[PDB]
Amino acid sequence: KLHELKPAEGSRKERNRVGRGVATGNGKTSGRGHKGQKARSGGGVRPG
Amino acid sequence: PRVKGGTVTRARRKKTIKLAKGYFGSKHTLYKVAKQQVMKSGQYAFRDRRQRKRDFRKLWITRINAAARQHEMSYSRLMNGLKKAGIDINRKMLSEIAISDEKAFAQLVTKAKDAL
Amino acid sequence: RQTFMANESNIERKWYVIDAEGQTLGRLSSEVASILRGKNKVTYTPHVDTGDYVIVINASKIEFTGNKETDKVYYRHSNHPGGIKSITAGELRRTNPERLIENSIKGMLPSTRLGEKQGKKLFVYGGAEHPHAAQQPENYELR
Amino acid sequence: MEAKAVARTIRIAPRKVRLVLDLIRGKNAAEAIAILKLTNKASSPVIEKVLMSALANAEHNYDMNTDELVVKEAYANEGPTLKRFRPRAQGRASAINKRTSHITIVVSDGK
Amino acid sequence: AVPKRRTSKTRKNKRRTHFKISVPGMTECPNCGEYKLSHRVCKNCGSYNG
Amino acid sequence: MFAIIETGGKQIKVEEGQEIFVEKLDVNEGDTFTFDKVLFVGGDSVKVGAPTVEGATVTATVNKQGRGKKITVFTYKRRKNSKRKKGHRQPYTKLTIDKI
RNA sequence: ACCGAUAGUGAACCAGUACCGUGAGGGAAAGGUGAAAAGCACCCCGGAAGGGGAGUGAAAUAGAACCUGAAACCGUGUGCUUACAAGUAGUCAGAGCCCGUUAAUGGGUGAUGGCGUGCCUUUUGUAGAAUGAACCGGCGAGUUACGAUUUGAUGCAAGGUU
RNA sequence: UAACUUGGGAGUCAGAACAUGGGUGAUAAGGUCCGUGUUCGAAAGGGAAACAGCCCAGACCACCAGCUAAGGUCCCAAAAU
RNA sequence: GACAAUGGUAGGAGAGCGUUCUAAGGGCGUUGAAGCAUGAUCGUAAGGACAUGUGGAGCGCUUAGAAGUGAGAAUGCCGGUG
C-alpha cells in the first residue's frame, strides 16, 4: 500500500548537521577545535 | 524548496517576553534584555529553593530557645534532655506547641529535666 | 506549611527600665540589644518589629576595665580634607554620658531599615529620673 | 453624549503642541477659547480652530446647549515625517526631521 | 564629551517635571464681557477704562 | 484537642474537622485511611508522652489524588556553553480528619 | 517534489532609467480598494487642508499615503504603591489593599527580612578598567559532482555484475 | 573490578597555585627549570570578612523532616556569658 | 520487585521537537481558512491544543520521501524608530 510504507529496519539513518545550536553537541566550532591550521576552511596537510 | 522563516521566530520570542511580565523598565519589553533576566531568575530559584529549608530551621530554634529561657534552662540543655527520654519531636512541632498551648510545653520541659 | 507569623495586628509592646550602677559598658549593652530586637519573645518574626521599649537610667557612674579611661579613643571624619577628630572614653563619659551608651548599643544592631527603627526605642538619661511616667515601666534584672 | 473634531497632518512638532493642550483639559468652553486667544504660541491659532469646529458639531448634528460644555479629551498624535538634509563642514551632511501631528478635541455635555 | 550610557525614559520624564507653561493671567473686562490681559486693552473694542 | 502524626519524614499537627495535604499514598479516592504513629496528644485532656503512644490511631477520608503546580528547573554555567531545562510536578494526597 | 516582491534576471512599475564621474565606468528604491467606480448628491466649521452627519456598498478604521497590520517608539485615562533612602534591579519569605479564572491547595500590586558584582569571545586566570552589540524587524555560514575506505540493510552465491 | 587485541571518529602540544627534594638567583621574587602528590583548568555547596588553586566536601528532580565534617556558640549572626 | 549509577570544557555515541515541498489515504472551511492579539491550559525539553476579538479564502491529520530546514553577537547588509 502506498499510504503505509515501512523501510527495512536498521537500513536508514538521519544525517548530522553542525553549527545548529549548542544543545546538539557541534554548535560553535563544529567539531574542529580552537585556532589551528586544521580549524580553517580549506583543509589541513597533504595525505602523505 | 526554499524554506523561508515566519511564525516560528516570533512565536518563540514572545514566550520569553511573557515570562518577564512585571519587570522594571526595558526588562519586560526587549527580548535580549528580558532573556538574560529569565536565565538569572531560573538560577536564583534553584539556589533559593534549597536555601529556604535552612532559613526555616533556624527560625524554629530561635523560638524554642526563647521559650525555654523562661524555665531557667537553655536550648542546648533542653534538646539534650529530650533525646535521653526519646521524645523524637522535631523543631517544627516543638515551636507550634510553644505558642498555642503554653501549658502543654511545660509538661515536656519537666520530663527533660527528670532524665537529666 | 503551618508556621505561625506575626503582624502589626497581634503585637503587644512593653516598657522596661534598667539601672546602670556598677555595670560594664559592653556587658550591659550586649543584653539590652537583645531586648530591642524581640529575641526573648516566643513569637519572634525576622521581618516584623516585635521588640520592647527600654529606658536606661544613670548613664554616668558606669565602669570601665583596665586602662580604658584614657586608652579608648573614638574617631570621626567631617568629609573634609584633613579633618579628623578624636575623644577619649573618659572625657566622653563626663561631657556626654548619654551619647556614650547609645553608640555602644546601636553598634550591636543590624544596619537595615528595620534595624534603624528598632534603635529609636532606646532612651538614655544621665541622671536618675526619667520623664516617662505616663507609661508602665518595670524594673528589669540583668541575667 | 460626546462630539469630536480631528485635524490631521499639521506642520507642527508633536512635542510643542502638547504644551498648549495641557492648559485646556477640563476647562469651560468659554474659558478654553479665552486661554487659546491670549497665548502667544505657534499652535494656539491651530488648536482653537479645532475646538471651535468641535463646538459647531455639538450644536448642529446634536441637540446640545453650548453653555454647559466641557473639554473631556485633548491629545496630539504624530504623523509622517518629512526628511530633509543640511550640509555641514568637511563635505558631509546631517539629517533634519520635519514632524507632523494629529490634533483631537472632544466636547461633552455631561450626563 | 559624548554620553557614556543611554538615557532611560524614566530619567527623561523626571527631568521634564518643571518644563511647562501656565495660564496668561486673564481677567474679565467689565465693558466687553470676555476675558482680557491685565493692565492691557480689550481687543474687541480697545477700552482701557480707569 | 490536637495530635501529632508522621506521614513519612514529615510531622504535622491535626485537629478534628480539618483538611491536610500529604505525600502520595496507595489508597484510592473516597476510601478511609488511618494513621498508626502518634507522638503527642494535646488539647483539654492530659498530654500524652513519647516516643509513641500505645494505640490512639487517627482516621481520615481521602478526597482526591492530584498533582502540584509545575515548576521549572533551569541552571547554566557562564561562558561555558552549558545549560539545562526541566519540569516537575509532584503528586499529593488530600485528606480530611474526622476522628482522633 | 524551481522563486513568490530584502526572494526570482540589476530591472514584475516606460530600468541600464534616477543618480554619481572629465572619461572609460558604476548603478538603485517603488506590486495589491471593491465583484462591479457604483470614487461620498446634499448640510455644518475655513481663506484652504481636514473633520462631523447623510448617501453608495456585505463591510468606508475597504476613501485612491486605500487587502491583513507584529515590534521598537510616542501620547490619554485608570486599580495598587512611593519624598530618611546606598539599588546587575532579580529570587525566596511575607502583612495590607483591589478583582474573579481554561475553577485551580486563583489573579493584580507590594510595608518589610535573607541571598545575590549582565551576556558572548579569548584566556593559567575576567564583575573586569581586555573585545563586541543603541534598540526592534527581515536576510546572513560543512553543500553538490566524481573516486577510496569502513559500518548497517537487501538479492545471488564459486560465482556476482553491468 | 577491571586489563589486552583488531577496526571507525576526535581533541590536545600557552598551563596555574599549594606541600615536598633540588639546580640557578642573593638559603630575593606572585621569578625560572626539573622529580613527586592535591586542587583549578572542566566543580557548584559550607569555612577563611570579601578572595580560581588553602580546609571540608563531589549538585538526577521535589519537601516549612533527622544526624554530622571543616570551623564555631556575648550582639550583628544559628548554637555554652 | 531488589540492587547499582546519573557535576562537567574540547570531543565521540544514541533517541527526539519544529519549518517548506511531494505521493497515497482520509478530513475541515463564508453557519467563516491562514495570519494577528489576549487568556489563570497540557507534556520530562525543543513544543501542542481550546475559547474569545480582528480577518476575509484557503488549510490541517497519518505513513513515507526530499531539503535554500531553526539566529543574540561577525566595528555584519538593508529599512524603521529612540
From TrEMBL, chain A:
Residues 1-17 have a biased composition (Basic and acidic residues). Residues 1-48 are annotated as: Disordered. It comes from the Bacteria. Residues 41-48 have a biased composition (Gly residues). Belongs to the universal ribosomal protein uL15 family. Part of the 50S ribosomal subunit. Binds to the 23S rRNA. This is Large ribosomal subunit protein uL15. It comes from Staphylococcus schweitzeri. The lineage of its organism: Bacteria, Bacillati, Bacillota, Bacilli, Bacillales.
From TrEMBL, chain B:
GO terms for cellular component: ribonucleoprotein complex; ribosome. InterPro entries: Ribosomal_bL20, RIBOSOMAL_L20_CS, Ribosomal_protein_bL20_C. Belongs to the bacterial ribosomal protein bL20 family. This is Large ribosomal subunit protein bL20. GO terms for biological process: ribosomal large subunit assembly; translation. HAMAP family: Ribosomal_bL20. Pfam families: Ribosomal_L20. The keyword Zinc-finger does not apply. GO terms for molecular function: rRNA binding; structural constituent of ribosome. Binds directly to 23S ribosomal RNA and is necessary for the in vitro assembly process of the 50S ribosomal subunit. It is not involved in the protein synthesizing functions of that subunit. Keywords: Ribonucleoprotein, Ribosomal protein, RNA-binding, rRNA-binding.
From TrEMBL, chain D:
The keyword Oxidoreductase does not apply. Pfam families: Ribosomal_L22 (PF00237). Keywords: Ribonucleoprotein, Ribosomal protein, RNA-binding, rRNA-binding. InterPro entries: Ribosomal_uL22, Ribosomal_uL22_bac/chlpt-type, Ribosomal_uL22_bac/org-type, Ribosomal_uL22_CS, Ribosomal_uL22_sf. Coiled coil: none annotated. The keyword RNA-binding applies. GO terms for biological process: translation. GO terms for cellular component: cytosolic large ribosomal subunit. GO terms for molecular function: rRNA binding; structural constituent of ribosome. PROSITE patterns: RIBOSOMAL_L22 (PS00464). Gene3D superfamilies: Ribosomal protein L22/L17. Part of the 50S ribosomal subunit. Belongs to the universal ribosomal protein uL22 family. This is Large ribosomal subunit protein uL22. It comes from Staphylococcus aureus.
UniProtKB/TrEMBL annotation, chain E:
The keyword Ribosomal protein applies. It comes from the Bacteria. GO terms for molecular function: structural constituent of ribosome. Keywords: Ribonucleoprotein, Ribosomal protein. GO terms for biological process: translation. SUPFAM superfamilies: Zn-binding ribosomal proteins. The keyword Heme does not apply. Pfam families: Ribosomal_L32p. GO terms for cellular component: large ribosomal subunit. InterPro entries: Ribosomal_bL32, Ribosomal_bL32_bact, Ribosomal_zn-bd. Belongs to the bacterial ribosomal protein bL32 family. This is Large ribosomal subunit protein bL32.
